[PDB]
Each structure stands twice: as structure tokens, then as C-alpha cells.
Amino acid sequence: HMQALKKYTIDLTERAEQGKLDPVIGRDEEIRRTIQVLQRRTKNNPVLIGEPGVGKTAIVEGLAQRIINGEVPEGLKGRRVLALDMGALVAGAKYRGEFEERLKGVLNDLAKQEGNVILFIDELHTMVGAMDAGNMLKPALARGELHCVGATTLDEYRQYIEKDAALERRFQKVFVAEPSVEDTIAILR
Ligand SMILES: [Mg+2]
């Protein structure tokens, strides 16, 4: 069971449990905000907004680390953070139809783990119009069968999410600015 999740997602909370995630520096406020949005009853899917290379994915890894560390509110305790693996979804698929079938499987598995998994979808706009899985994502989001964190640029969010109420009512912008040079080089060992 949950074959789609094992095949097409990367368990970031597991990577944290294994000590494989780099410490995340200078993002206390963005991680806290991401958590606050996720905890909402409605419009509870945060979308990290920023230019490429600003480190949005690191914020998601930071969220995973905090959960493992228990540095999160009570209801988020024991939650799993899974990143949609686009490379894996496309590997050996060849056709859009096969890709869609695999994505559908992922959503089905998530509908069974409602409230236990947070899915991270990088470059979210590419899944809703920028290969449009909007039809399956919209009801999943509305029914709480999909609780996720997305990442895009402001212009991409405006063009593909903000103009579509079925999507916009479910997402919340969380801005991410470029990190300081100091914090960027701090990751080196
Ligand atoms: Mg980035």
C-alpha cells in the first residue's frame, strides 16, 4: 500500500531522521510562517514565493527538521513531509497519460493519509497550466485530501494561481527573499 508515495516522493522527514539534511540558517521567520499557514483551517496551503535560487526548498527541509525535532505545534507532531519527485514521476513514463496516472496514484495515497502528510510541490505552476493537473488537484485541496507547500515566483503565482479561485482560495503566499551572503556560505564545511 502507498506504492505511489514510495515511488514518486522523497521523504524529507525521513532524511532529517537520518541526519542527512543540512542545517537551515536565517529562515526562522519563514519556517514559522509556513507552519502557521499549514495549521489554518482554510487557505492552509502555503506557497513559498521567490526567484529561482533563493533557497525556497531549504525552508521546506527546515520544516521537516523542526517536525523531527518536535520544534512545532502539537498537531503537526509526527507529520511527514514528502517532496513530489518530478524526476521519478517522469522516469520511464514516456507519455503524459502515464505521468498523469502516476500523479493520480500519489493523490489517491494521500487521500488515505489525510492529515498525516504534507506534500511539497516545487514549481507548482507547472502542474496547473504552465500537463495541467488542476482538475485533480483542485478537489484534493478543497477536501483536505492534499495538504501541501508549493513554490513559485510571484509572476508565476499571479498568472497560474491567483486568477483561478479554485486554487487561490486554497493557497497563501509566503515570501522568500535572497539569503545573505553570510548565511549562504555558512553551509560549507
Ligand atoms: Mg529555490
From Swiss-Prot:
Changing R170A: Loss of ability to form oligomers. Residues 3-178 are annotated as: NBD1. The modification N6-acetyllysine is found at K20. It is found in: Cytoplasm. Changing E101A: Decrease in ability to disaggregate proteins due to decreased substrate-binding activity. Retains hexameric quaternary structure and ATPase activity. Changing Y95A: Decrease in ability to disaggregate proteins due to decreased substrate-binding activity. Retains hexameric quaternary structure and ATPase activity. ATP 1 binds at G50, E51, P52, G53, V54, G55, K56, T57. Induction: By heat shock and other environmental stresses. One peptide binds per ClpB hexamer; the binding site is formed only upon ATP-driven oligomerization. Homohexamer. The oligomerization is ATP-dependent. The Clp repeat (R) domain probably functions as a substrate-discriminating domain, recruiting aggregated proteins to the ClpB hexamer and/or stabilizing bound proteins. The NBD2 domain is responsible for oligomerization, whereas the NBD1 domain stabilizes the hexamer probably in an ATP-dependent manner. The movement of the coiled-coil domain is essential for ClpB ability to rescue proteins from an aggregated state, probably by pulling apart large aggregated proteins, which are bound between the coiled-coils motifs of adjacent ClpB subunits in the functional hexamer. Belongs to the ClpA/ClpB family. Part of a stress-induced multi-chaperone system, it is involved in the recovery of the cell from heat-induced damage, in cooperation with DnaK, DnaJ and GrpE. Acts before DnaK, in the processing of protein aggregates. Protein binding stimulates the ATPase activity; ATP hydrolysis unfolds the denatured protein aggregates, which probably helps expose new hydrophobic binding sites on the surface of ClpB-bound aggregates, contributing to the solubilization and refolding of denatured protein aggregates by DnaK. This is Chaperone protein ClpB. The gene is clpB. The chain holds residues 159 to 351 of 857 of the full protein.
